[PDB]
């Protein structure tokens, strides 16, 4: 059976690692073998905006939206493991994309 990969994306480090811990621990408990987590490189957008409504070109604010990525690979899935994963709900605002094979 092909392994199932779970890519978790979030704007928070602690929240994404909490969800990842939940997933990996569940997988270990339900008799699955899991090769994770892998901390993939985190994107960091940047934005620079004038804070002065008129002129004052040198007054600026730089902001950032850091996007964290975690990869959990579950090799050799079982129906029991998959059902446990299904019935486990993850913290909101954390995106999860599942690639299959």
């Amino acid at each position: 059976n092909q392994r199932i990969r779970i890519r978790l994306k979030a704007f928070d480090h602690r929240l994404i690692d909490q969800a990842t811990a939940e997933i990996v621990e569940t997988a270990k408990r339900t008799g699955a073998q899991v090769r994770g987590p892998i901390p993939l490189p985190t994107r960091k957008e940047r934005f620079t905006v004038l804070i002065s409504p008129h002129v004052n070109k040198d007054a600026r604010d730089q902001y950032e939206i850091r996007t964290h990525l975690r990869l959990v690979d579950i090799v050799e899935p079982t129906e029991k493991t998959v059902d446990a994963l299904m019935r486990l709900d993850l913290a909101a605002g954390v995106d999860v994309q599942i690639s299959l094979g």
């Binding site: 934005f47 905006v49 004038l50 604010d61 730089q62 902001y63 939206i65 850091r66």
Partner: protein, 100 residues
Amino acid sequence: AKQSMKAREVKRVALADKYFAKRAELKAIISDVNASDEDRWNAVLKLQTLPRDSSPSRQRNRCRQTGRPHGFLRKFGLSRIKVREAAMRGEIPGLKKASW
């Protein structure tokens, strides 16, 4: 900006989506390499007949909360001032003052 300007933007978007297919096909036949020259001429004439505002290059992005025609940011859809306001109020998720 003026309510009339914002309404004008809405009208332009409406027309642009309305004539998308015709604009695309007419442009295709106009620029087709192996096309009848007479057909290409007819297609050019039809494209000229089509409404000006239908063109998707005649619409300008404007701040979705005020309408400011300058300083737009596609990521948020707002201008600099409103972006700063929302960022401080913590309504834009993830946005934070950063230093490196």
